[PDB]
Design a protein around this nucleic acid. Structure first.
Length: 77
DNA sequence: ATACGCGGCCGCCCATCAGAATCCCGGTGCCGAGGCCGCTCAATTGGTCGTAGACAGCTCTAGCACCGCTTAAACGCACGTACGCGCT
């Protein structure tokens, strides 16, 4: 909770809306998703799972089909 | 002129003397251990030095084990085609 509150306060306080990578094991990823949405619902929590097609989903959701649209910030790898 | 005799010939069983052939004992040639041997030059003997390599200490790689997330590869089965192989 201190990490989520520190990231939220750092984004909405010091104006640091940039992408922040938070590596979390696969077993704890749904727990950090439920806690993350329960304590900070205003921020998305699109994590990174899968193997092949899910990688294509994360890549098609990452940027737009053009030769730089950041639609995320916090993820779990 | 007319009737009796016989003469060697011959099948016969029956006798004598030599030759052929099997068994009782044989010499001969070939092979392989033996013996002999002898001049002698390679192993053995007695001996020194030194150095490889056994051995104990040590540390410091890498071979093992073990686990779990991820997924490519193996599995087993279903269906048919195009070869193995049999015949002529």
């Amino acid at each position: 909770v201190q990490t989520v509150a520190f990231i939220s306060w750092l984004i909405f306080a010091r104006r640091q809306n940039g992408p922040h990578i938070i590596v979390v094991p696969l077993s704890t990823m749904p727990a950090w998703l439920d806690t993350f949405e329960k304590w900070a619902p205003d921020l998305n929590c699109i994590c990174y799972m899968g193997n092949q097609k899910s990688r294509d989903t994360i890549r098609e959701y990452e940027f737009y089909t053009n030769p730089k649209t950041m639609k995320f910030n916090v993820l779990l790898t």
